[PDB]
Amino acid sequence: VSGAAAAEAALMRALYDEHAAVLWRYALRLTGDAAQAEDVVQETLLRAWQHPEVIGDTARPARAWLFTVARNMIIDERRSARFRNV
Amino acid sequence: QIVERFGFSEIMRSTLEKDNTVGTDEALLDIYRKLRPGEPPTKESAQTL
DNA sequence: CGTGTCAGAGTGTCACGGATGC
DNA sequence: GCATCCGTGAGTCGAGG
RNA sequence: CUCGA
């Protein structure tokens, strides 16, 4: 029903309150730019919303899946486009 | 034990009274929310940092 | 491309005025 | 009704990094 | 950064 679609938005708002602020300090050390870390956080949680497999098992650490997704985004941002210009 | 150590001065008696929150697990979370805001405050996540 | 422990910044100015705020 | 705090300003020119 | 009036 209509209350079932609102439970999906209340589920995302939950993982924000426990992981977003901790994930932000992880990307900040990897990049050094605070405004870049916020970009990494939004992209990471966006993939969590697109991967129901990572939001399924709470008995499996979901915080860690974020730190490696953030690792892969920063190592990809760390390729050719950054290489010349930055 | 705080009043026992800082009792000889009246400026410290006015500090524990004007204080807002009391409790070992209470002022430990008060420090956590001003130091690392936006994070869930656990009695053992502030005991760690 | 896929992604499932966690690892986490700079700090020795000041005078002065007026909007900002308990 | 007022103490607080924010934002503003703080010589000019020249040579090499 | 370092110096010249």
Curated annotation (Swiss-Prot), chain A:
Disruption phenotype: In a single sigL or double sigL-rslA disruption mutant, no visible phenotype; not more susceptible than the parental strain to several oxidative and nitrosative stresses. Infected BALB/c or DBA/2 mice showed a significantly prolonged survival time relative to mice infected with wild-type bacteria, although bacteria proliferate normally. A motif (Interaction with polymerase core subunit RpoC) lies at residues 39-42. Keywords: DNA-binding, Sigma factor, Transcription, Transcription regulation, Virulence. Residues 15-82 are annotated as: Sigma-70 factor domain-2. GO terms for molecular function: DNA binding; sigma factor activity. GO terms for biological process: DNA-templated transcription initiation; regulation of DNA-templated transcription. Signal peptide: none annotated. Induction: Expressed during growth in culture; expression increases from lag to exponential phase. Has a weak SigL-independent promoter, is also weakly autoregulated, no other sigma factor allows its transcription. Forms an operon with rslA. Sigma factors are initiation factors that promote the attachment of RNA polymerase to specific initiation sites and are then released. Extracytoplasmic function (ECF) sigma factors are held in an inactive form by an anti-sigma factor until released by regulated intramembrane proteolysis. Over-expression of SigL induces 19-28 genes including polyketide synthases, secreted and membrane proteins. Might play a minor role in regulating SigB. Interacts transiently with the RNA polymerase catalytic core formed by RpoA, RpoB, RpoC and RpoZ (2 alpha, 1 beta, 1 beta' and 1 omega subunit) to form the RNA polymerase holoenzyme that can initiate transcription. Interacts (via sigma-70 factor domain-4) with anti-sigma-L factor RslA. Belongs to the sigma-70 factor family. ECF subfamily. The sigma-70 factor domain-2 mediates sequence-specific interaction with the -10 element in promoter DNA, and plays an important role in melting the double-stranded DNA and the formation of the transcription bubble. The sigma-70 factor domain-2 mediates interaction with the RNA polymerase subunits RpoB and RpoC. Extracytoplasmic function (ECF) sigma factors are held in an inactive form by an anti-sigma factor until released by regulated intramembrane proteolysis (RIP). RIP occurs when an extracytoplasmic signal triggers a concerted proteolytic cascade to transmit information and elicit cellular responses. The membrane-spanning anti-sigma factor is first cut extracytoplasmically (site-1 protease, S1P), then within the membrane itself (site-2 protease, S2P, Rip1), while cytoplasmic proteases finish degrading the regulatory protein, liberating SigL. This is ECF RNA polymerase sigma factor SigL. It comes from Mycobacterium tuberculosis (strain ATCC 25618 / H37Rv).
Swiss-Prot record, chain B:
The gene is rpoB. The chain holds residues 247 to 295 of 1178 of the full protein. It comes from the Bacteria. Belongs to the RNA polymerase beta chain family. This is DNA-directed RNA polymerase subunit beta. DNA-dependent RNA polymerase catalyzes the transcription of DNA into RNA using the four ribonucleoside triphosphates as substrates. The RNAP catalytic core consists of 2 alpha, 1 beta, 1 beta' and 1 omega subunit. When a sigma factor is associated with the core the holoenzyme is formed, which can initiate transcription. Interacts with CarD, TRCF (Mfd) and RbpA. It comes from Mycobacterium tuberculosis (strain ATCC 25618 / H37Rv).
